[PDB]
């Protein structure tokens, strides 16, 4: 029922998985801030990356599906009355991590959803396949709010799909690093990172 809804739904990574992903994120920043291919393109990133993305989530990482504001968000009730939503509540999932991105605003991870997980998914509003926004925020610039992460990921996918993917500029240990221009960086993983999580609601 509407009034019992959560603030939002999502895949909340397990402690072990959350920490794995948190670790892997900081390595991408440690290795990105020191990659010469990035040090030249600092004019288009700014006027140490871990510190730049100093606003990090304070608990476990999670992949948001539907912001609900306790039933009073747009479409909140309808998402909740879906048979997949009320049945997969409290069930455990295995998300795939596709790439890790870095813009001058936010740093995050991209999620590729299985057809079954996509049943839980509710400008960039156009052209791309569903669930393309699916992510995990790993950091934010001091003055940037986290919802920005979803739109940068879409901005990158409108680019790679656009053809402006741009050839490889750097080889990292976990995958090849690409540079899409306006301070946007992407690490496409040689082996996708499988991360465990639970589908549930966030309360207070």
């Amino acid at each position, epitope marked *: 029922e509407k009034d019992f809804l959560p*603030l939002y739904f*999502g895949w909340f990574l397990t402690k072990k998985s959350s920490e794995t992903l948190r670790k892997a994120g900081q390595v991408f920043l440690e290795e990105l801030g020191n990659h010469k291919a990035f040090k030249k393109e600092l004019r288009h990133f700014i006027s140490e990356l871990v510190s730049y993305f100093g606003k990090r989530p304070p608990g476990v990482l*999670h992949c948001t599906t539907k*912001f609900c504001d306790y039933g009073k*968000a*747009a479409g909140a009730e309808e998402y909740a009355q879906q048979e997949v939503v009320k049945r997969s509540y409290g069930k455990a999932f295995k998300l795939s991590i596709s790439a890790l991105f870095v813009t001058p605003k936010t740093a995050g991870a991209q999620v590729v959803l299985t057809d079954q997980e996509l049943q839980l998914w509710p400008s960039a509003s156009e052209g791309l396949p569903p669930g393309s926004r699916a992510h995990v925020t790993l950091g934010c610039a001091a*003055d940037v*709010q986290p919802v920005q992460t979803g739109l940068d990921l879409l901005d990158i996918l409108q680019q790679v799909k656009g053809g402006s993917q741009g050839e490889a500029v750097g080889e990292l240990p976990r995958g090849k690093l690409y540079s899409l221009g306006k301070g946007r960086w992407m690490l496409s993983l040689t082996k996708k990172m499988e991360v465990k999580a639970i589908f549930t609601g*966030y309360y207070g």
Partner: nanobody
Amino acid sequence: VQLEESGGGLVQPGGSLRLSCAVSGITLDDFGIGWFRQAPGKEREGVACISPGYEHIYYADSAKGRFTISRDNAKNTVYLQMNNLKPWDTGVYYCAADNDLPDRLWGGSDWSDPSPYDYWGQGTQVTVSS
């Protein structure tokens, strides 16, 4: 539970105004505050926001550098310093309080969406002549 704005009125272009809300029955340690503007016929559009986590102070691109939001938690009053004001800022500036700041930021909500807020002030009328 009361948010009373104040400090609005007339000002010429380029002038400055400092709005103030006296939050009551709620505390700025638990609630983030959004300052909103409602101009004639437009919809409520967020100008600035301060959450209790202190690293969450945001500004709308229009007022990113002209305005400054702050709090004196001792006086549980929030402030909005507006510099180099233009007629396009004319509007009613309302003050909103939301206990899910910053939590919702990390779960798909935008600070400037006014729907998630929980309590709204009465609005102080601001007007930049011409």
